[PDB]
Design a protein around this ligand. Sequence first.
Ligand SMILES: CCCCCCCCCCCCC(=O)O[C@@H](COC(=O)CCC)COP(=O)(O)O[C@@H]1[C@H](O)[C@H](O)[C@H](O)[C@@H](O)[C@@H]1O
Lengths: 116, 531, 80
Amino acid sequence: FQQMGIYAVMIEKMILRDLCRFMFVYLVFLFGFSTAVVTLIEDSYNSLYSTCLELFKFTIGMGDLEFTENYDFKAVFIILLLAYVILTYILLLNMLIALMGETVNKIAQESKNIWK
Amino acid sequence: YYKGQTALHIAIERRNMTLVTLLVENGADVQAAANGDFFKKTKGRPGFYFGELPLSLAACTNQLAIVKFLLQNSWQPADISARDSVGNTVLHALVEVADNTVDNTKFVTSMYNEILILGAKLHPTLKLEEITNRKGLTPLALAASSGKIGVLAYILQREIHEPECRHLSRKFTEWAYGPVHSSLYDLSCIDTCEKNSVLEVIAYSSSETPNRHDMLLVEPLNRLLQDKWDRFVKRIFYFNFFVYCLYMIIFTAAAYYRPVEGLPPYKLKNTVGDYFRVTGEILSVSGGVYFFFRGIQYFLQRRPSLKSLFVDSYSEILFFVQSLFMLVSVVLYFSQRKEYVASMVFSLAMGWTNMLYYTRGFQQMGIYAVMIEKMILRDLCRFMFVYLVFLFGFSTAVVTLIEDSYNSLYSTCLELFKFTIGMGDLEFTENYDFKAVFIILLLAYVILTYILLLNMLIALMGETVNKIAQESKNIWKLQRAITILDTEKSFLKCMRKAFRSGKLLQVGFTPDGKDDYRWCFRVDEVNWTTW
Amino acid sequence: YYKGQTALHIAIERRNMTLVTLLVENGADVQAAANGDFFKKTKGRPGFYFGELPLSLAACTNQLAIVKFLLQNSWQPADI
Ligand SMILES: CCCCCCCCCCCCC(=O)O[C@@H](COC(=O)CCC)COP(=O)(O)O[C@@H]1[C@H](O)[C@H](O)[C@H](O)[C@@H](O)[C@@H]1O
């Protein structure tokens, strides 16, 4: 199916390229701020797994910004979360769309040849 | 202003060969040290540089006849190697007058080549382009340091087809079969002049040079950097990356298992876990101070001053700031305070986000990392001014209105922030009257910010991506270049593997009877030109 | 490296048909099985592949006269 075959090939190429380029950066930022936050908040989460999850949730639009109160240094904790949200949800996710836009402009013609 | 003028400079300024000839025939002086402020350096005031020499004056004016005549007078000839009050000669003036336009580039190319050849034939025994000014710069070093890319491109690829006169040129041919041509580029003064090489003055430029990014694309440099990369630097850089990753893992582990008792320092226990932990803390602090001293070494060796720290060397600054946070953590640790964790935490966060520094070396990733750097500089200032303005406006309006639990500029700033990450409520309180006003404010805020401004951000990042497609490759090549130079420069083991394809002979015979060695670099090409 | 050389490929490399004519008239052999490492495949090292036949050199070099002459010698013609 020509019109759909091209689209499927574009998906294949963008999965190979941009979800290595993106995911290295994203996992680096996420792991960094996860380890920072879980280092800080130590009295129910208190766990690198649960904090990695809760910081993941800011990317799908369900972060809380007050997912615990069991800590001191509340200014530090908020600064970490705001820095994470700004660097990841606002910047990097939108840069992803911009770069996929440019790469789509690049592989307009390559895809037809790949499909053939 | 027109100080130290002479009629020779007037005639040459007027492009009158006859007046020049008469003035020489009338016994005019050669060493016209015209230091006129109108004809001095510092072109901020209107003026045109001559540098206290009629040869420079004729050459910058594209007057070949005057130049040759001055070099071949009967009454008194001119010596090209005469230097002005700054120490500049004709070549430094030739460099200065270029601006990398096409016709100016061709003019300076022609004039430079001819002047140099004439200097050689008049005094084959004496050198010219090795002569340095008070700052110690050759014409090559000068043209590099100021982004005179055209004349730099010329100088790096001088080739002469004339007997007994190839000694000036520097791009040679070892052999040339039908399609196969194997050239040799001289790398003298490229890796080291003992003061400042070409690469040093390019990569460590002051960032105001308008085209420093592209200067590394000129053929012998790019070939050279890539060769050095594959030779030994790639392994050292990957090793450094691996060591840094181990350091970050150790730091993460040592921090995560910190004890939760009061008031450090915490005395150790006999369990082996505490030995692992305290060794981890020691290694972490050691790494922190190590980066501190590398930062200081950068600052002392390069001495940037108040300008490049805003536009350049973000990586060195950020690694230094990590070191500062670690040190503050050590201080607060041993001052019997709990707050040390705050400092440690910040360091740890930066300790991971600086991992992106090591993306250079991986082409497809390095370009992406550079694009992130450029967007964080540009669009998250342009955006955040507007966004903070709207947010603060509607926050103060709403908190002004709703006053009976929030009743607070902080919590309302958060609640209005949440509309940007997709968790606003639209009914986050009911403690007010004027419900229509409150809803109108929130709907206006949501429309202006969540609907419009974020989507402006996406569109503009799109356009900037379209713009910086090519700039990023040049920036990345520069970052790899500065990495190579810094790795070579120290290396902490007293080895010099920077040398080129042997001390190859230039000709084995200069105009003088002695031989000559070049330190050439080979480049093989196969092409259907020259047929 | 330059194993199995004959002057025919020197003349042809130099694009001098006259020397080729002389060498053929002097009874130079055609099937010059030069296995020189300079003339093998894999041009990553400097080299120019023609494959153990001077006719290949002449054709590879855009020399129509040499190839026709080699194919139409009196002493010994070339076989493609
Ligand atoms: C609150 C707690 C959390 C705070 C986290 C902050 C994370 C910052 C984001 C990650 C930084 C990654 C990095 O490593 O920094 C990036 C630059 O990003 C930034 O500046 C962000 C500033 C803000 C690499 O840029 P780099 O310094 O290598 O290149 C320089 C220079 O070296 C070149 O010679 C010359 O061409 C210059 O034009 C330029 O190219």
